[PDB]
Amino acid sequence: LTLEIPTSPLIIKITQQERNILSNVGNLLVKAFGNYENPDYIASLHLHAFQLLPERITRILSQFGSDFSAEQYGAIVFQGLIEVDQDDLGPTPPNWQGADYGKLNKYGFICSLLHGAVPSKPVQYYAQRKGGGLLHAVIPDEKMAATQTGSGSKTDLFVHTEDAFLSNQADFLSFLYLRNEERVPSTLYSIRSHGKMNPVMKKLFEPIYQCPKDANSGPTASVLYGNRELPFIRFDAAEQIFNENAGQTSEALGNLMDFWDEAKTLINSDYIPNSGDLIFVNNHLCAHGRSAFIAGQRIENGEIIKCERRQMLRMMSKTSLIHIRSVTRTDDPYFIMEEHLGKIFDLD
Ligand SMILES: NCC[C@H](O)C[C@H](N)C(=O)O
């Protein structure tokens, strides 16, 4: 019978036994490898992922990695993946630069294991903080309050797939919420929520769209690619549509406007992540964002509740080092040097 169109992500309630295993597995890996960027750990990542993760998590992620069917949302919420000791974590640093990665080391092991079970290899992009490592602290900055970045707060972060301007954008993403006391909803948008291929969607297969770099003669790409009936997406609502300098053709902007009108009714803002929740996303199916918020506060019965500022950890991964090899550093096949749709950063 009828197709069952996904409108929300799969919600997995992590158990106390699973939390405890992940903690003690994380603690063992820190003692064994020191840090999650250790080359000996990375080379044997999939082995540790499949051997050390709780069975149910491994099944969920293994199934998800190869699932591009009509019923797949392209996002999983792992509720209560970790217990965050808020007093040990201490105050949120002023910016991402202030993050203590010694503190976050266990979290980066746990996150890399989740990517390893897909299977997928964690990667870093020069397009993102000159690399910034395999794990990124996403903290609101007062200086970059009304910006279209993770460092943003005061404004809503319109739905986007990560790095729509790169031909070698992340395959999978994980967002580990350490703190979300402001109670900011995590917005998600799946191309699968559209259902069957329609004429509005078909126009997005044309490589007539500008994909500008993060907040004239640039190269163009297709918004939809992959299988013609069940496609993959590269989309940035703020950079491709709502940016004056997008440099779109009238035909291209119209097709993007027509698409946006359909897509915006499908955005899911129902999920407000709690501390210790992780959102695992297939970056080719599901776009992400987050609503506008005043960092360090929430409002209850018309009263301002001051709180600790939002703190989230982002990890990105690629399922094949082979494909991206032309754009990665010679001395590091996990470091992507791509700047814009095939073009590589010219440093000297
Ligand atoms: N559109 C991606 C932007 C990143 O989330 C944030 C950026 N690296 C920053 O934290 O300054």
Ligand SMILES: [Fe+3]
């Ligand atoms: Fe993003």
